[PDB]
Ligand binder design. Structure first.
Ligand SMILES: *[C@H]1OC[C@@H](O)[C@H](O)[C@H]1F
Ligand SMILES: *[C@H]1OC[C@@H](O)[C@H](O)[C@H]1F
Ligand SMILES: *[C@H]1OC[C@@H](O)[C@H](O)[C@H]1F
Ligand SMILES: *[C@H]1OC[C@@H](O)[C@H](O)[C@H]1F
Lengths: 500, 500, 500, 500
């Protein structure tokens, strides 16, 4: 098994970089009732500071237009939709990790598009027109929300320009130019606004080295580096879904650690580094996302990810998505932490559990994190992800946890194949694509962790915990100080109740 | 164990008389935010039709007042509070099972009072004035709610008049006179208004014989007989609480059965019989009410009480109560199905579980009830009350349930000593009297039945249910047809996901 | 002025056909938070039973798709969105007046499209697949909401086929076929499902005749005739808006009266007549919709339309629209009764005012309507639209209304250029395109009718009302019985208060 | 009329001391639903920082109890209720201006009580037991809310001890002893908790000179001086209401000033001064509270009171009151800014209007206040209370206001006998005591100020306002820069709309 004696002291800190940002489907979808109810719901449980998605300039949001009169053609920047979208974000208490893109059609130099909703991925016909659009939007943001607010919004230029699907011909140089023109337009508005990139996907880090060298040699400002991370191997789509083998979380933490080094060996060694999008599979139709395995797996990344990066946004917070058309079933492998109808997937609870962690990191290994909060209470999280099939997926634990107080109240939350696994149940129901309200209700009741309370006696400043982790289980223990008030109950004696 | 083969048909039906009416603390408390929130919470889970409680005429509600102009004394009827209370009841979707009482101070003949809030319990100094009061109030309900709504309200006269604590000297003669004047006044406003009594507690059923014969020989209107029922032996209060031995459910059931028989053998053999108030203990400070035990014990009463009475009102719906002063801790043995801070007790889920029962009663025995719904689905409810210390409380079950389909989706809900037991957690916390918001949150999360789902196949029209019931457990099983859609998912194969 | 003595009684009735249905932007938009909040807000004030809009089969809702397996093209029906859309409707208490259309891209024969959102308007490439899509959809509805529910939904086939914009070549022949097939496939699902058409716009009434003869001769089912009505003359769009002279309401009423005759003269003389879409201007950018004029104008139609049709649906209920792109300002001449940010336009209150109408019509002329409600109270609505430019816009009135009671309470509500005119205030602010929260709040405070109360003593069963209507005003007078309680207050005397 | 030229200059500030605190009925009522919804309502409209009322220790809240075990009698402090009350207050965002009192029954030395709810007005039998109570309560507050939070709560000792009705025999010396014991108990808990008194009503300011002198001689700590002020003369109660002449606001403002000077000449010259209770009439049944008069009257105090005091709390925020038994009609002369059923009274809008004032005072006199906000926009409030019967009550105005912009947007709000006067409408209904839902709805609709917008151009930095103030009217004018966007609407032209 795994015997562990948690140190009573430690000089390691656990930050909340894991909850800095969360991803989302294109901004246009944010106008949806379903989208907003779910965002509010997530924010009532996980305090994400930012939310990052594509589509700010896409035509459904409808910002860039052009009015034609016999005499001239002049641009018209329409803010009716983003005002509403950004107004609701600020109301909910979350800020946009703005992504500049994609190319509105009236400015497109080409016709290439991406996804079901067809965002244009070609450079602008006229870079100056693109520069004025960016400034027009920035000035509108300042006008409506004030410069103090907007200055907190980082601006990421484009998305995965290294892939021919998001950027015409994967033209590295044209990207650097787009970045230059955009960065200059933003800075012109206000020199303190944060700009960055290159928002590339893995397997092309020579882009980050080039990107940084370009900003250096061309004297172009950069306030942060962005990149994406996935651990899913190549797969084969069916007209409904796709399966991909997920490599261990080790490969992702290593990619983090690797690109971090590239930034420190570059001309801008202290640049903050954001993983603006990550998950196991990079497909919005891969079943693994809705499983308990996904939640046990992500656990470690939330545990160690912050050691190498400034943030890492989980893609996504909801199944309200469309890159591959409208979802066709209650569970379809969406990126969402929360499935449609506000049904939290196990992964949702992994994030929820980390909300209990303190800054003092007493102990940590590849399958367990132990911290202490301000008040002195101790929280512990352990996970048991099953990478491949086996007959011994169980793992026993015995941990000695240091505790200030003598009397302890214990609160244990758990999720695994039988607890907080709405997916398994949906399978019991016959995988309905469009369940009834009664069925969705049963899925909500099921989608909750198991809660168990107890009390022990901490001896010489320590408490011994023994537990077993089933297949793909994630557990959260909280040890707070118990202050017994039983003596104040005159005549208290439970044994005088029938059977106790 | 307990092997049972449930029949395909039966000549028995199961009514919903078990949810006709529920009890409440004095009406004046309906003015509380805590009270209304809680009532709305119960109604969202249990479709109670009526709500029965004391205090309609008590001075906190303030209906009866007297204005003095010189040496003249004119009465004044203030409807400000009742209007707000009854307005809030009808808005929530529940009607009052009116209880005419107690005695307004200005109309009292003596000074004897009952409870911490001192409801005067002496007859009126002038039965005329009392009669006018009764008529003034009804004409107001009529005037504000319309005769059509008020005709749906029954009017029970007084409360347990056979006890000297609730009616001076337990004067049976004066009560019969009280009843005559009151019933007469009611009928005069509108003879369709249901009036009844005698509202006595157990151990004095001769009071009913005397009552009925009093009406049958005095031609006094009577639309229903009401009585209370408990199974708790005399106990001895401590300044904080009291314990009492609770007897088996048989006693209460046989009591329902006895009195029901005292009526069929009466001069009004067809009068409806209402148990306007029941529970294990008749004390608002008996810890037994907050236990899983209570939940299991009342389960059988819901299953059979309907056979003998037109309705039985569990006392009460909430711990918002003040008979023995303001509650002094999160759990204090109050009558409520719901503890303060809207924390449902296990008995709450016993009622909740019965909502799954259909009208077709296929099988039933002292510890189990099986029914079929309109759509063919079948539901089962078993309970295991452990009425005494025992090294072994567990019970084994094996039930063959007839099902008109082969593929079955199973939804199981369980409450016992480790599930849906906020009381057990409260103790784990050191029995906090005034718990913080985090504690109350923990209690709320624990206070939920364990939901568990599965899917098996039926053989020879029978689905075999094998399960054991732990200490004081209550389980719900709903078996519905599983209509599998798994075939419409192209490429579907969970084995292609890590570990699966 | 206009002196009118309202007849003591009458045998004519005012029906609520005016509130039977209301229009809406494309169904896909019903997914919007703004849409839903607005629909609920409307339904709390005006009880519309049905809602009519296009886009049911348009690809944004996404019902029709095609899976490519190997070399076989299998059709797929995705209900994720209409299920969410129709649930919200039914949840709110409003049913869809279904409109079958337009052509999903995959089944489209041509490439022609209409509107900013490109709804394909060509016939199907295979009328078989069309019929199968139709039955697939209907069955699902049946399966999800039950046949008893789906039976209450009428089915309109396509939209204004008599116009090249919505139907390729306005081919009258094809429409009759598409209708034959569609009206058939529906019936095959269930013979009681109401079907109708041709839902043409005014001017081409020859279509209704050729339609009612097509059915008769080719033996095609028909349960209703649908047509649209508009009184706006042609105009010339600027890239932002359009102005159009609006003809008098008389033109519209005459058309209702006309087309209704064509039906009573046809083979189907008892067919119901539905005006599934009407308003002054048929453009979503004609400022007239946002004005006090548009409200005093529509008053007379809500007042008389019912005399000729089974229903007439105001297009639309909200400015949440996109036919001509995303709106570019708080007021942009949208069809809505309610402007974005839930700001009611004066027309909204014209409908609202009609709720006060009883069924007993005592009087009515081109500018007034007086009805008596069941309880006896009387209600009056008078409107003064200013059609052209004049220098004497105001109108004086003197109406003797028959009043059952002797003491009257008068509640007067009024809207005009100075009251309930958020548009005028919007102008005072400088016509802001994207108003701040404070400005929207001011618009909301302003967007309400003026309210005045008073009290008169009816003499000889009649009450004399002298009022003055300003430019484009619409007023509501409710006359309920006044039962004075002042005498029950001992010492009551306002003169004993400073200055009274 | 009155002609005023507001100087474009400011040497004095206008603070928000007017909204520092508001009054309330006894704490035990804070448990009512009506109460809380109303407190939330008021807070959404006025940012009151504190709320001050009686009954913290009274027995309905029930903190002080005594358990009798055998012979030994042990005190028990039950926090169930205040915990709920103060939880609700902090949740809403308003802190308690704690008033220690009255005397719990079991600790009383005498039998004298005050008000319908009978709060005990005699000194404690044992000052040590009272001292322990104070400590227990404070220690609990710290335990539940944290020290940082409780340190912001001021502690006023008792209420109007100078009156025989609230303090047995108006024993000045016994009150100073009560203050010392209490203050010392408070300071024992925490040295920096704010304590003060004497909370006397007018006419006995020597209690104040004696109070400060007592604290000096006995070295008893004191942090503030509290006092009450009313301007109603003697009246003669009827069993239902009371009338009293209200003296000019000058009287009250001069009392604030007189007492302020007394504190300055004491041993503690810099002590803050709080008027913990004020209004016109001090009776919870004097109709003046509900009239427009009261609104125009209070206007001047809100305007000048902050000049002499650190706060002045209007008694009360809501009609939820019981001092003189449960209210008996929709309007009854309650102290509330808001009447039952959340119907704001005119005074409510006087406070609401003051939210508009900025810190820069530009002009002020007995009937007008003009200030400038931080963004440069200007606000003006003028009032015209009619102190006595008159045929000529109106008051005309011409005010020249300086504005830094040329294009001005004007928002004007007005309450008077005809606008926002629910009392007036209520009378029109016959003065119903228990209005129907419909009538309550009509009053709510009337209970709003008249809103009117417009736009003028200033001439040489000045805008001229011309208006007439009706009887008891209060007007608010907000002038903000008008930034016209009309030029961006291509083809805009309202004249192209029928009648425009
Ligand atoms: C990163 O990979 C996942 C995909 O859904 C995102 O759109 C892309 F940016
Ligand atoms: C019935 O017993 C319980 C008690 O609380 C009730 O008041 C009584 F009527
Ligand atoms: C009827 O005219 C108005 C337009 O918006 C609709 O689309 C059309 F059917
Ligand atoms: C001050 O006068 C008004 C009364 O209602 C308060 O109780 C008193 F303190």
């Amino acid at each position: 098994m795994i015997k562990v004696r948690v140190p009573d002291f430690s000089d390691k800190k656990f930050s909340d970089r894991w909850r800095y940002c969360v991803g989302t489907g294109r901004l246009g979808l944010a106008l949806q009732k379903e989208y907003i109810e779910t965002l509010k719901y997530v924010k009532e449980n996980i305090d994400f500071k930012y939310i990052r998605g594509h589509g700010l300039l896409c035509d459904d949001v409808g910002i860039y237009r052009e009015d034609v009169v016999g005499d001239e053609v002049k641009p018209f920047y329409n803010f009716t939709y983003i005002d509403r979208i950004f107004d609701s974000f600020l109301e909910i208490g979350i800020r946009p990790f703005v992504e500049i893109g994609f190319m509105p059609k009236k400015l497109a130099s080409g016709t290439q598009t991406v996804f079901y909703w067809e965002g244009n991925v070609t450079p602008p016909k006229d870079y100056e027109k693109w520069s004025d659009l960016v400034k027009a939007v920035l000035h509108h943001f300042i006008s409506r929300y004030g410069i103090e607010e907007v200055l907190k919004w980082p601006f990421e230029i484009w998305n995965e320009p290294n892939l021919k699907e998001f950027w015409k011909d994967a033209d590295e140089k044209e990207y650097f130019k787009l970045y230059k023109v955009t960065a200059k337009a933003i800075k012109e508005v206000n020199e303190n606004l944060k700009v960055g990139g290159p928002a590339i996907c893995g397997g092309a880090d020579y882009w980050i080295e080039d990107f940084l060298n370009f900003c250096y040699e061309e004297n172009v400002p950069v306030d942060f580096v962005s990149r994406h991370a996935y651990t899913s191997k190549q797969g084969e789509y069916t007209p409904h879904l796709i399966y991909q083998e997920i490599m261990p979380s080790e490969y992702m933490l290593n990619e983090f650690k690797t690109v971090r080094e590239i930034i420190k060996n570059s001309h801008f060694p202290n640049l903050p580094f954001h993983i603006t999008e990550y998950n196991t599979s990079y497909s919005p139709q891969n079943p693994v996302h809705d499983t308990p395995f996904n939640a046990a797996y992500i656990a470690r990344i939330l545990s160690e990810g912050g050691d190498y990066v400034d943030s890492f946004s989980y893609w996504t917070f909801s199944d309200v998505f469309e890159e591959r058309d409208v979802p066709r079933s209650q569970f379809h492998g969406g990126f969402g932490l929360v499935a449609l109808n506000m049904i939290p997937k196990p992964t949702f609870y992994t994030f929820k559990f980390f909300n209990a962690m303190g800054e003092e990191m007493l102990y940590r290994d590849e399958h367990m994190l132990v911290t202490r909060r301000d008040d002195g209470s101790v929280a512990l999280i352990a996970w048991n992800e099953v990478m491949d099939k086996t007959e011994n997926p169980d793992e026993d634990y015995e941990v000695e946890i240091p505790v200030r107080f003598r009397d302890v109240f214990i609160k244990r939350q758990l999720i695994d194949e039988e607890h907080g696994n709405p997916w398994g149940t949906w399978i019991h129901m016959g995988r309905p694509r469009y369940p009834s309200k009664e069925q969705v209700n049963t899925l909500r009741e099921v989608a909750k962790p198991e809660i168990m309370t107890s009390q022990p006696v901490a001896n010489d400043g320590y408490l011994n915990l023994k537990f077993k982790l089933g297949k793909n289980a994630v557990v959260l223990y909280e040890l707070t100080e118990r202050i017994d008030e039983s003596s104040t109950y005159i005549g208290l004696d439970d044994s005088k109740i029938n059977g106790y």
